[PDB]
Design a protein around this nucleic acid. Structure first.
Lengths: 88, 95, 131, 71, 275
RNA sequence: GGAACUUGAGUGCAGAAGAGGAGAGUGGAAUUCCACGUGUAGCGGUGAAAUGCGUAGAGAUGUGGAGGAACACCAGUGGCGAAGGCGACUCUCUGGUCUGUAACUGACGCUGAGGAGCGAAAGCGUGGGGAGCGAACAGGAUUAGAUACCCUGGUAGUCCACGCCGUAAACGAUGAGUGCUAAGUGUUAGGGGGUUUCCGCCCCUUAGUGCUGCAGCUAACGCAUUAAGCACUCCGCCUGGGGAGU
């Protein structure tokens, strides 16, 4: 969906703060989970062109956010992409 | 998991014992699917504005269950195999 | 998308002249308040007063109006624009609308009128012309 | 200007109905022609009328109401 | 799937072969192997009743009980194997008895799935239950004409059949190409159309693969000498001037019915020739 | 370049609806065909007719069966979607939009050649389907001629599955983003309040969308908080007609 409990688990693991609801960390994390589920959804049906373009938009989002994260703190960025295993 | 309301028709002409057989069967399937009971009612015999296969009237029956989410997918074909049942529909509960 | 607050304030004051409302609000910046002070010196506008609220803003500007109707300014334009840099040597600066008009030219000494700029002999970016 | 005759009479004693389990009120919605009444008479907002539309379609799936009859 | 070959040679230009994805094990069980001497199409008298047969690759029969006479005993699909004898793939199935019998394989079957041969068995694919218990309109394969005789109907790959409805005697069935017969209600049948539907799409692509089939070449009739064929003679590509296109045997072939007008099966033919 | 801020923007919490996308199942009415019952000389079609169907019993009517396609009425300058476009119902997975106190991130934004994807209808390739409709075509009429408009038929196509093709008056003939600029009268979904338990009335505030109109713009027609108004940012495009989108 993803289910609400998985979100509550996914957020707390990556927060830099006790109440860090925002942050590029948690944002790129939740968006990553959405990218994974939507990607598997694309794998289930190749005819989903709207889900595909929406996935492209979300890829634009992840690319912009990770780009700015590269623009800010490279250490947190490399630690994060190493934590996720994403980005080339 | 989510709530589900389900209606189905059993044959008006069926013997009460055979009706007990198909109802215990539908219940055994419904519990085999993990669909926990929430509530139920018996509309029973009612006249029809139009016949389905041929019958001029039918026995409505309904159930309300907390369940998957996966179970209805198996429940449908098993609701199709029986000649004794006429129709069945599973609507999500979001009043 | 809010590409330039100053040109935005200029379309604010021009539209304000078009609608003849007594006053209008603009977001704060020292760059804005300085040139607004320059207009306050030129007297085309009656008064300007800032009102603090977190964080930036909000200046309130009061348009001046003539005793015998007529718009106080017959024209206003920002020759400077993003995607087209402009520069002006101190002797090269035009005297727009001859003696009536005044340039608004930001310099190293700060924003200056074309007369004061000619006196200081200081060149700089030409922010806008008002006449 | 402005008021509609026989407007609503539903929100006044609603709401959240039915979604389709009832048969009496749906018997009220049906016309002699067997079709759902127009908003000009029913008085409902378009969203309520459309949720009512899908609801009555569900009722037709339940065969609780006629699909077509005499006029 | 179909693996297209790159035209490395003239025989590669069109040849295609099936994916063989269904196949699991390289070799058949030894217990059910049977000999297949190639008659070559000759009569026991030694004369060739059938033209252009034999010369093909050697083949070895796998025992297959289409009859499925046992019932009430659950089975399991252990393996699937290639069948040279026919287009349909074979899928081995292990009975709970420990008995093993190769069986015709409908598409979409999975390894290890349970299969009951009894009347009480589920509609689920691979099961075979009597027509009386079959719901109307479900696809059925390997239909027997009479019980205990085996299912001569719908054995080839990709073929299917459907029930139009049923009486006590007899159940209706849609045979392939739309023909219909009142098959006996007591008679057994197996739900689910046969797999390997892609076999029709396969392209041989060369004369050499045909030799392995082995489909021997057939001479065109006009080319043949007039004594040998009715359309023979003439001075080079003789026109089919003679009335009514003909087989080398005297019966006409184009549009001429070969049916016996009087037959025991004629009563069963509710429908014929839909084209 | 360093250090900060939340208003741009994103995320979250609490809600809101939508013919949004794809998959699977299901629905009833009607057209058509078949089978039988009923009953008899017309039926059908046009401006008029004729081709056509029908005593081998049609048309009509009653009943049953088969198959395909489309979703009436609800339906509403309604809604969703980037456009193209999406209108029966159910379920499965899933994209996007809007509102509201307000938590967090603290400019992380906009546009965008090349490039990539989607992209009506028609068409092409392969395998199925084909009830009706229907290019080509056949026949009958119309006319001086009728390779048409009309009628009776009817193939490809229209339908599905896997691909290609990437053209449309693909229009709002108005690129995308943002700020500001009299108003009015409806609707589409939200939010707050001023009496009332509620019903319901009134006022305000967001976004979608219809019309009328102030300023302003205009070759004129008209546009007009959905500018074609006043400004900003970026991309696409125009330079007389024919020859030639050759």
């Amino acid at each position: 969906a993803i289910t609400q409990e998985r979100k509550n688990q996914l957020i707390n693991e990556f927060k830099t703060h006790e109440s860090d609801t925002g942050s590029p960390e948690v944002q790129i994390a939740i968006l990553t989970d959405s990218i994974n589920n939507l990607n598997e959804h694309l794998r289930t049906h190749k005819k989903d062109h709207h889900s595909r373009r929406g996935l492209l938009k979300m890829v634009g989002k992840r690319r912009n956010l990770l780009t700015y994260l590269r623009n800010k703190d490279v250490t947190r960025y490399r630690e994060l992409i190493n934590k996720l295993g994403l980005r080339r | 998991m989510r709530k589900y309301e389900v209606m189905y028709i059993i044959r008006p002409n069926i013997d009460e014992e055979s009706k007990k057989a198909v109802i215990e069967r539908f219940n055994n399937v419904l519990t085999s699917n993990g669909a926990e009971i929430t509530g139920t009612k018996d509309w029973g015999k009612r006249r029809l504005a139009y016949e389905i296969n041929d019958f001029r009237d039918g026995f409505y029956q309904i159930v309300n269950v907390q369940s998957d989410a996966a179970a209805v997918q198996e429940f449908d074909r098993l609701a199709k195999i029986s000649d004794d049942i006429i129709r069945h529909i599973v609507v999500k509960e979001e009043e | 998308v809010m590409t330039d607050p100053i040109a935005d304030m200029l379309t604010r004051i021009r539209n304000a002249n078009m609608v003849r409302h007594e006053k209008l609000e603009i977001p704060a910046s020292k760059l804005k308040r300085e040139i607004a002070e320059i207009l306050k010196r030129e007297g085309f506008i009656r008064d300007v007063e800032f009102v603090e609220d977190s964080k930036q803003g909000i200046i309130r500007v009061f348009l001046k109006y003539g005793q015998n109707n007529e718009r106080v300014i017959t024209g206003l334009k920002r020759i400077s624009k993003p995607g087209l840099r402009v520069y002006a040597k101190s002797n090269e600066v035009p005297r727009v609308l001859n003696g009536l008009g005044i340039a608004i030219i930001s310099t190293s000494q700060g924003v200056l009128t074309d007369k004061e700029a000619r006196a200081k002999q200081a060149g700089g970016e030409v922010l806008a012309y008002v006449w | 200007r402005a008021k509609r005759r026989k407007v609503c009479y539903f929100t006044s004693n609603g709401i959240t109905h039915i979604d389709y389990k009832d048969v009496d009120l749906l018997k009220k919605f049906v016309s002699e022609r067997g079709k759902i009444l127009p908003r000009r008479v029913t008085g409902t907002n378009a969203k309520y009328q459309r949720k009512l539309t899908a609801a009555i379609k569900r009722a037709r799936q339940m065969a609780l109401l006629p699909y077509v009859s005499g006029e | 799937a179909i693996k297209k070959y790159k035209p490395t040679s003239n025989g590669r230009r069109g040849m295609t072969t099936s994916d063989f994805a269904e196949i699991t094990t390289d070799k058949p069980e030894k217990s059910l192997l049977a000999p297949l001497h190639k008659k070559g199409g000759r009569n026991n008298q030694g004369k060739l009743t059938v033209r252009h047969q034999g010369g093909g690759h050697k083949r070895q029969y796998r025992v297959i009980d289409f009859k499925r006479d046992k019932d009430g005993i659950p089975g399991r699909v252990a393996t699937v194997e290639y069948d040279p004898n026919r287009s349909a793939n074979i899928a081995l199935i292990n009975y709970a008895d420990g008995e093993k019998r190769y069986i015709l394989a409908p598409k979409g079957i999975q390894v290890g799935t349970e299969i009951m041969s009894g009347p009480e068995a589920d509609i689920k694919v691979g099961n075979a239950l009597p027509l009386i218990n079959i719901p109307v309109g479900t696809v059925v394969h390997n239909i027997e004409l009479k019980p205990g005789k085996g299912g001569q109907l719908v054995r080839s790959a990709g073929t299917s059949a459907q029930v139009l409805g049923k009486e006590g005697k007899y159940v209706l069935v849609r045979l392939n190409s739309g023909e219909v017969r009142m098959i006996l209600s007591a008679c057994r049948a197996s739900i689910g159309q046969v797999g390997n539907e892609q076999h029709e799409l396969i392209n041989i692509g060369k004369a050499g693969r045909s030799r392995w089939k082995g489909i021997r070449p057939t001479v065109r009739g006009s080319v043949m000498n007039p004594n040998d064929h009715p359309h023979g003679g003439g001075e080079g590509r003789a026109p089919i001037g003679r009335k009514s296109p003909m087989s080398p045997w005297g019966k006409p072939t184009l549009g001429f019915k070969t049916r016996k007008k009087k037959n025991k099966s004629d009563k069963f033919i509710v429908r014929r020739r839909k084209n």
